[PDB]
A = this chain, B = another copy of it.
Amino acid sequence: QALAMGMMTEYYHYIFTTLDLFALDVEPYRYSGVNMTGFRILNTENTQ
């Protein structure tokens, strides 16, 4: 709904107070110009 109202541009920045931002499909949004920052406690670096 933020995309359909064209509200994800170069001068919008979204902080998501959640720990599952990494599980979003960001593929329509990756080129959009939109800055969007979150947090993640789940280690996606550890091979274990």
The interface of chain A, by Cβ under 8 A from chain B, is 3-6, 8-10, 28-29, 31-34
Main secondary structure of the interface of A (DSSP, over half): loop
Inside 8 A of A29's CB, which chain B residues have their CB? 4
Contact A31 B10, beta carbon cutoff 8 Å: no
Option from B5, B10, B28, B31 in Cβ contact (under 8 Å) with A33:
B5
Q: How far does the Cβ of A5 sit from chain B's closest Cβ, in whole Å?
A: 5
Which among A6, A9, A29, A32 has the greatest number of chain B C-beta atoms within 10 A? A6
Contact B5 A32, beta carbon cutoff 8 Å: yes
Inside 8 A of A33's CB, which chain B residues have their CB? 5-6
Inside 8 A of A3's CB, which chain B residues have their CB? 3, 6, 28
